[PDB]
DNA sequence: CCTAAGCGGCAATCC
DNA sequence: GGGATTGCCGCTTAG
């Protein structure tokens, strides 16, 4: 839905920039959360009736290590920019802010992640994100990069 | 009245 | 019983 594509030079300029922030947040091979949201539990309501998890419904879960740090968006609304040039929108939320995730719909960051471990055929419908995928991909980091917009940041995951 | 999932927080764990 | 951290689950609210 709400998602843009930047164009290729204006990806250079932006990326071009220094960063008055930054944060490596690690790509955890938890397997019921984070990038593995899929195999947990899915929602159910008070009568047992349960709703599997989407396979693109992802979440950064973000020590309190790194949302400590200075300058790092606890509990805000931002636009993210990827280096291979997507623009959409993420929110943190959850106890310590250490929820990292696209907004209004959690798929649209999987999709991003996910589609891009896809391609580079690392990874494959309803498989388990393990080591050996972040291994094979070459990241097992993301890297949030502020702007000289307080409300749009850099997002990166690249691969081999 | 609903249903569905965005996102807030529960709870398992380790001190 | 308490706090501190965060996987993981499902409450609550907007549609």
Redesign the pocket.
């Given at each position: 839905l709400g998602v843009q594509k930047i164009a290729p030079e204006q990806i250079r300029q932006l990326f071009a920039q220094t960063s008055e922030y930054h944060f490596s947040i690690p790509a955890?091979t938890?397997?019921?959360?984070?990038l593995?949201?899929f195999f947990?539990?899915?929602?159910?309501?008070?009568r047992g009736f349960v709703?599997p998890r989407?396979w693109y419904?992802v979440?950064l879960?973000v020590?309190?290590?790194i949302?400590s740090q200075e300058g790092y968006p606890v509990?805000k609304s931002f636009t993210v920019i990827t280096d291979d040039g997507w623009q959409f929108q993420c929110?943190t939320?959850?106890?310590?802010s250490?929820?990292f995730?696209?907004?209004?719909?959690?798929?649209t960051l999987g999709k991003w992640i996910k589609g891009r471990l896809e391609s580079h055929g690392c990874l494959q419908n309803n498989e388990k994100i393990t080591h050996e995928t972040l291994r094979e991909y070459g990241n097992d980091h993301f890297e949030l990069r502020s702007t000289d917009n307080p409300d749009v940041w850099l997002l990166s995951f690249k691969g081999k």
């Open positions: 955890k938890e397997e019921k959360s984070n593995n949201v947990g539990e899915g929602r159910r309501d008070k709703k989407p419904e979440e879960i020590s309190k290590d949302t509990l929110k939320s959850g106890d310590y250490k929820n995730r696209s907004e209004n719909d959690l798929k």
